[PDB]
Amino acid sequence: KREHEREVIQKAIEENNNFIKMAKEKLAQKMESNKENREAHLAAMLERLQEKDKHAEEVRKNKELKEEA
Amino acid sequence: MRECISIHVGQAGVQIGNACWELYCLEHGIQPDGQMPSDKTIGGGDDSFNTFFSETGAGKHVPRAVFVDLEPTVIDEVRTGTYRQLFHPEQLITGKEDAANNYARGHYTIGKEIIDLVLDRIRKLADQCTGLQGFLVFHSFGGGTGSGFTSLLMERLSVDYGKKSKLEFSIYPAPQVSTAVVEPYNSILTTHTTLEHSDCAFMVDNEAIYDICRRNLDIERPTYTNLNRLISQIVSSITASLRFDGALNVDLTEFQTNLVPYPRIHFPLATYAPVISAEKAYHEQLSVAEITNACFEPANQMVKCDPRHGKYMACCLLYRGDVVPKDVNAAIATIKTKRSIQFVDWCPTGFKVGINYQPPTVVPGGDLAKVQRAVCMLSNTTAIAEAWARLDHKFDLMYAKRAFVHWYVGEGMEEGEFSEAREDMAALEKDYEEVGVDSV
Amino acid sequence: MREIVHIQAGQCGNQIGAKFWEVISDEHGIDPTGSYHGDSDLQLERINVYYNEATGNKYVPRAILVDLEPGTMDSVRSGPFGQIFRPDNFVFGQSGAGNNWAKGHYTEGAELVDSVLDVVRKESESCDCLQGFQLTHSLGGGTGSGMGTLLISKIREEYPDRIMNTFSVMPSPKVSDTVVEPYNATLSVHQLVENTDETYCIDNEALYDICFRTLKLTTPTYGDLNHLVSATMSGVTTCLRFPGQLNADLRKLAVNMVPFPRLHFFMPGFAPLTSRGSALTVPELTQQMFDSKNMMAACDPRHGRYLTVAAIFRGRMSMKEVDEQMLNVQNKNSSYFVEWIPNNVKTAVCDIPPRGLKMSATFIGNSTAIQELFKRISEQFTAMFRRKAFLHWYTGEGMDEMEFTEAESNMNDLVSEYQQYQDATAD
Numbered sequence: 001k002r003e004h005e006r007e008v009i010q011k012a013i014e015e016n017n018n019f020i021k022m023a024k025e026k027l028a029q030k031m032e033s034n035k036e037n038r039e040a041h042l043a044a045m046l047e048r049l050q051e052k053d054k055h056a057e058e059v060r061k062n063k064e065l066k067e068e069a
Numbered sequence: 070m071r072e073c074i075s076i077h078v079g080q081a082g083v084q085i086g087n088a089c090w091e092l093y094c095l096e097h098g099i100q101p102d103g104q105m106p107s108d109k110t111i112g113g114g115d116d117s118f119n120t121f122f123s124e125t126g127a128g129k130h131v132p133r134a135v136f137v138d139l140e141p142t143v144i145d146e147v148r149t150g151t152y153r154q155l156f157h158p159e160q161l162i163t164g165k166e167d168a169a170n171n172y173a174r175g176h177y178t179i180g181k182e183i184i185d186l187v188l189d190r191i192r193k194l195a196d197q198c199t200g201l202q203g204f205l206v207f208h209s210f211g212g213g214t215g216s217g218f219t220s221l222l223m224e225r226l227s228v229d230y231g232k233k234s235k236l237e238f239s240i241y242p243a244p245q246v247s248t249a250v251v252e253p254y255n256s257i258l259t260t261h262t263t264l265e266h267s268d269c270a271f272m273v274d275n276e277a278i279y280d281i282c283r284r285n286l287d288i289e290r291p292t293y294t295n296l297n298r299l300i301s302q303i304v305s306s307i308t309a310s311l312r313f314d315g316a317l318n319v320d321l322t323e324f325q326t327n328l329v330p331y332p333r334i335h336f337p338l339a340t341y342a343p344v345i346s347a348e349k350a351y352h353e354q355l356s357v358a359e360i361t362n363a364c365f366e367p368a369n370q371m372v373k374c375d376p377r378h379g380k381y382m383a384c385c386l387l388y389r390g391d392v393v394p395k396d397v398n399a400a401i402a403t404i405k406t407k408r409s410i411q412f413v414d415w416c417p418t419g420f421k422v423g424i425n426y427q428p429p430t431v432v433p434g435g436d437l438a439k440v441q442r443a444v445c446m447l448s449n450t451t452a453i454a455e456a457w458a459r460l461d462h463k464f465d466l467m468y469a470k471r472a473f474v475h476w477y478v479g480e481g482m483e484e485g486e487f488s489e490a491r492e493d494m495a496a497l498e499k500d501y502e503e504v505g506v507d508s509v
Numbered sequence: 510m511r512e513i514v515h516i517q518a519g520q521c522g523n524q525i526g527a528k529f530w531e532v533i534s535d536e537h538g539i540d541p542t543g544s545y546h547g548d549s550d551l552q553l554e555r556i557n558v559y560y561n562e563a564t565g566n567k568y569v570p571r572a573i574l575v576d577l578e579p580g581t582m583d584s585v586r587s588g589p590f591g592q593i594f595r596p597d598n599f600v601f602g603q604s605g606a607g608n609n610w611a612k613g614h615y616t617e618g619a620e621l622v623d624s625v626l627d628v629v630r631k632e633s634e635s636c637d638c639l640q641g642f643q644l645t646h647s648l649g650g651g652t653g654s655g656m657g658t659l660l661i662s663k664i665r666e667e668y669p670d671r672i673m674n675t676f677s678v679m680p681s682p683k684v685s686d687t688v689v690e691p692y693n694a695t696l697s698v699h700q701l702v703e704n705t706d707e708t709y710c711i712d713n714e715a716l717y718d719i720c721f722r723t724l725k726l727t728t729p730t731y732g733d734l735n736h737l738v739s740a741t742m743s744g745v746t747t748c749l750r751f752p753g754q755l756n757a758d759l760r761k762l763a764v765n766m767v768p769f770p771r772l773h774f775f776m777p778g779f780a781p782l783t784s785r786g787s788a789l790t791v792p793e794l795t796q797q798m799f800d801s802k803n804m805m806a807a808c809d810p811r812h813g814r815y816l817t818v819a820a821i822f823r824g825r826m827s828m829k830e831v832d833e834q835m836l837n838v839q840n841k842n843s844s845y846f847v848e849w850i851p852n853n854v855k856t857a858v859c860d861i862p863p864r865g866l867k868m869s870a871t872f873i874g875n876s877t878a879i880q881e882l883f884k885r886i887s888e889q890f891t892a893m894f895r896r897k898a899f900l901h902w903y904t905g906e907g908m909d910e911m912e913f914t915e916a917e918s919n920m921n922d923l924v925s926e927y928q929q930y931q932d933a934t935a936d
C-alpha cells in the first residue's frame with residue numbers, strides 16, 4: 001500500500017510536469033513557426049519591390065540606348 | 070491566504086476591471102485613495118478581503134490586479150480616473166499600438182513585445198501572496214488583444230504556474246455592440262488555444278446584457294458603462310465567497326467541483342436577479358422566491374440559449390443579502406414542480422446553495438436599484454453549446470470564402486491553425502451532445 | 510499617438526490636398542499661420558494624427574508636396590493656407606511630366622523620387638507610432654499617376670509594415686479631353702492593386718454628374734469638383750481626426766473593409782448634396798447616402814453586392830434613430846449585401862459636423878459594383894491599344910507592349926475577381 005501511495009503522488013507530479021513541458025514546447029514551436037512565416041512574407045514582398053527597381057533601372061537603360069541612336 | 074490575482078486584458082477586460090474594482094471598494098468600504106477605516110490591522114492581515122487586496126504600510130489597500138492593453142488610451146483613463154491612486158503604476162501596462170482587431174497581432178506580432186513584461190509584473194504580485202489560489206482573466210473574445218494576447222498569456226501562465234487555477238470572464242461577441250467583422254475568427258482562435266489552459270470560463274453574451282439593460286432598466290441605447298456595471302454585479306456575486314466569509318458562505322471552488330464534470334465542459338451559464346430600476350424597485354420588495362424564480366427565465370441569462378431545450382449537469386444558487394435557508398428551500402421546491410429542469414441521468418439533481426449576508430451594493434448614480442437581496446445562478450447546461458453553434462456558423466460563412474484570412478496569414482499564421490481551431494470547436498459541440506445522451 | 514504622413518503629388522493631388530488641409534484646419538481651429546484659435550478641446554485630443562507640434566504652439570501639417578513642375582507648387586504656397594506648410598517639404602522638379610505615365614514612373618519622377626523619400630524619412634522618423642501614408646493624386650496626368658505609384662513602391666520598400674492609403678482620382682472624358690488618360694489610369698491601377706492597402710476611388714465622371722445633375726451646374730469647374738472631394742476627404746478621415754469609442758486608425762479600417770487584399774477599392778458617398786438656392790432628418794440622410802446619385806464613383810450599387818460598408822454620421826442627432834435607420838436599410842436591401850460576411854456594415858457618430866452643416870453622412874463601401882468604374886477605363890484603354898495609338902509617348906521612355914498588356918490583363922483579372930464574389934453565395 002505504501003508503494004502504491006508513492007506511485008500515485010509520483011504520477012501526479014509526472015503529469016503536471018509533462019503538462020508544463022508540453023505547453024512550453026508548443027508555445028516555442030508556434031512562436032518560431034510564426035516568426036519564420038512572417039519574415040518569409042516580408043521577404044517575398046521586398047523581393048517583388050526590389051524586382052520592380054530592377055525593371056525601373058532597365059526601362060531607363062532602354063531610353064539611354066535609343067536617345068543616342 | 071488563498072489570494073486571487075485578476076488580469077484584465079484589452080479594452081473590454083480593462084473597462085470591466087474598472088467596474089469590478091470600483092464595486093469591490095464600495096462593498097468593502099475602501100476609498101478611492103486606497104484607505105479603509107474599518108481595517109484596524111495596518112500593513113497586512115488575514116481578513117477575507119485580503120484575498121483581493123494587499124495592504125501597504127501606509128494603510129493603502131492595493132488591488133491584486135494587472136491591467137494590460139496594447140494601446141494606452143483605455144488604461145490612461147484608469148491612470149487619470151477616480152481610482153488612479155488605488156493602483157500602483159507598475160500594475161497598469163500599455164503599449165503604443167493595439168492589435169488592430171487581429172488575433173495574430175495580439176498573439177504574435179505586437180503581443181510578444183510586452184508578454185515578458187506582463188509576466189514579470191504578475192510574478193511581483195504572486196510573490197506577495199502567501200497562498201496564491203489562482204487567476205481571474207477578464208477579456209473579450211472578439212478583440213485582437215482580448216483574444217490574441219489573452220491566449221498567449223494563458224499559455225505562459227500554465228508554464229510559469231502549472232495547473233494552478235485559471236478562471237475566465239469572457240465577453241461573447243454580439244452584433245448590437247460589436248467592434249470588428251473578424252470577431253468570429255478571433256473568438257474561435259482564442260477558444261481553441263485557451264481551452265486546455267482554462268479550468269472554468271464564465272461567458273457573457275453582450276447581446277444578453279444589452280437586452281437586459283433595455284428590458285429591465287429601460288435604457289434605449291445602453292453604453293459599455295451600463296453593461297459593465299451589470300457585469301460587475303455577476304462577477305461580484307461569483308467572487309463574494311472569496312472576498313467575504315460566513316457560516317452559509319460556500320467557497321467558489323466548491324461550486325467549481327460541481328460545475329465541471331469533464332475538463333472541456335467548463336463553461337457555466339450565469340443568471341442574475343433582480344435587475345430592476347430604482348423607479349420599479351420603489352415600494353417593491355422582491356422576495357427570495359421571486360428572485361429565485363427569475364433565475365430560470367431565459368431572459369435573465371448572461372448567454373442567450375434555451376436551457377429548456379437542453380439538460381442540466383449542475384445548478385448552483387449564490388444568494389447575497391437578507392436570505393435564510395428556510396426561504397431558499399421553499400423557493401426551490403416550488404420551482405422543481407413548475408419549471409423545465411431536466412438533469413442528465415449521471416448526476417444528482419440537487420441544487421447547491423450558498424448565502425453571503427453582505428447585501429448587494431450599487432454604484433451611486435448608477436441605473437441599478439439597491440435591493441435587500443440578490444441571487445446568481447451558475448448552471449452547467451448543454452444548452453450553452455448553442456452559443457458555440459451560432460459563433461461557429463459565423464466562422465464558417467467567412468472561412469468558406471477565406472475572407473479576411475490574408476490579414477492573419479500576413480502576420481505569420483497558417484490556414485492550418487484556422488481549420489485546427491474550427492475542428493476543435495466541432496469536437497466541443499460533439500462533446501456537449503455526448504454528455505447529454507442517456508446511459509445504456 | 511498614431512501619426513499619418515500625407516503626400517500630395519501632381520497638379521490634382523496638390524489641389525485637392527490643399528483643400529483637405531484648409532477644411533480640417535478650420536474643423537480643428539487652425540488658422541493659416543498654424544496657431545490654435547479653437548473653442549473645444551475635442552479638436553486637439555487627436556490633433557497630432559495629421560499635424561506636428563512645433564515651437565510656440567504652431568501646428569504644422571505633416572504633409573509633403575510633390576510635382577514635376579513648380580506651377581501648382583507656387584499657387585498652393587500663395588493660397589490661403591500656404592504659409593502653414595513646412596517650407597522644406599516642397600519638392601518640385603522642372604522638366605515636367607507632360608501627362609506621361611512613363612516619365613513620372615521611370616524617367617523624370619525617378620530623378621526626383623529619391624529626394625522625395627528623404628523628406629518622407631524625416632517626417633516618419635519624427636513619429637511616435639506611424640500609422641502609414643495617404644497619397645492624393647490623379648490617374649490621368651503624369652506626376653500623380655506615374656511618380657505617385659513609383660513613390661508607393663519605394664515607400665512600401667522601406668515601410669512594408671505600414672498602411673498605404675491613396676485618394677486616387679479617376680480620369681473622365683467629361684472632365685479632361687487628354688487622349689492618353691486611359692493609358693495612365695490602367696498603368697496606375699496595375700500598380701495600386703499590388704502596393705496599396707486601401708484606395709478611395711474618386712471618379713471625376715461621378716463628380717461631374719453630381720455637379721451637372723444634382724448641383725444643377727451647367728459648367729462645372731475644378732473648384733466645384735474639389736468641393737465634393739474636400740467634403741468626402743473630411744468625412745472619411747473624421748474618425749481618424751476626432752475622438753470616440755472607435756479609436757480609429759488606418760489598419761483597423763483595412764482589416765475590416767478588405768476581405769481579400771486585391772479588392773481594396775472603396776466607393777465613397779456623401780450626403781446631403783444640396784445646391785445654393787434650394788431640416789434634414791436621419792431617415793432621409795441614411796437613404797440618401799445609399800443612393801446611387803450620392804456616390805463619388807460612377808457605379809450603381811444595385812448592380813452589385815456590398816462586401817463591407819462603413820458609415821459616418823456627423824452632427825448632433827439621435828443615436829438610437831441612426832441605429833434603427835441603418836438596420837432598416839440593410840433589411841430592406843438585404844439582397845445587395847453578401848451573406849457570407851456577417852455584420853458587414855459599421856456605423857459611427859461624431860458630434861462635430863462639417864463647416865456650414867448641421868448633419869451629414871459620409872459613405873465608405875467595398876462594393877463589387879466598383880467593377881463598373883474599371884470596365885469604363887478598360888473599354889477606353891483597349892479602344893486605343895487595339896490601334897496602338899499614342900504608344901510612342903511611352904515606348905520612347907523605355908517601355909514596351911508587355912507592360913501595357915500586363916496592366917490590361919491584371920485590371921481585367923481585377924474585374925473578374927469582383928464578379929466572382931458578387932456571384933458567390935453561402936450555400
Ligand SMILES: Nc1nc2c(ncn2[C@@H]2O[C@H](COP(=O)(O)OP(=O)(O)OP(=O)(O)O)[C@@H](O)[C@H]2O)c(=O)[nH]1
Pocket residue numbers: 078079080081082084085138139167168169170171175209210211212213214215216240241242243246247248249252275293294296297300
Ligand atoms: N461588455 C463589454 N464589452 C466590451 C467592452 N469594450 C469592448 N467590448 C467588446 O469587445 C469586443 C472588441 O474587443 P476589444 O476589447 O474592444 O478589443 P481589444 O481587446 O482592445 O483588442 P484590440 O483589437 O487590439 O483593440 C467587442 O465585441 C465589444 O463588444 C466593455 O467595456 N464592456
Ligand SMILES: Nc1nc2c(ncn2[C@@H]2O[C@H](COP(=O)(O)OP(=O)(O)O)[C@@H](O)[C@H]2O)c(=O)[nH]1
Pocket residue numbers: 518519520521522524525606607608609647648649650651652653654678679680681684685690713716731734735738
Ligand atoms: N477633381 C479634380 N480633378 C483634377 C484636378 N486636377 C486635375 N484633375 C484630373 O486629373 C487629370 C489630369 O491629371 P494632372 O493633374 O495633370 O496630373 P499631373 O500630371 O501629375 O499634374 C485630369 O483627367 C483631371 O480630370 C482637380 O483639381 N480636381
Ligand SMILES: COc1cc(S(=O)(=O)Oc2ccc3[nH]c(C)cc3c2)cc(OC)c1OC
Pocket residue numbers: 248249250744745746747748749755756757758759760761762763765766817818819820821852853854855856857873
Ligand atoms: C477613418 O476611417 C474609419 C475607420 C474605422 S476603424 O478604424 O474603427 O476600423 C473599422 C472597425 C470596424 C469596422 N467594421 C466594418 C464593416 C468596417 C470597419 C472598420 C471605422 C470607420 O467607419 C465608422 C471609418 O470611416 C470613417
Ligand SMILES: [Ca+2]
Pocket residue numbers: 108109110111112113114115116124
Ligand atoms: Ca488589515
Ligand SMILES: [Mg+2]
Pocket residue numbers: 079080140167214
Ligand atoms: Mg483596443
Ligand SMILES: [Mg+2]
Pocket residue numbers: 520650
Ligand atoms: Mg495638368
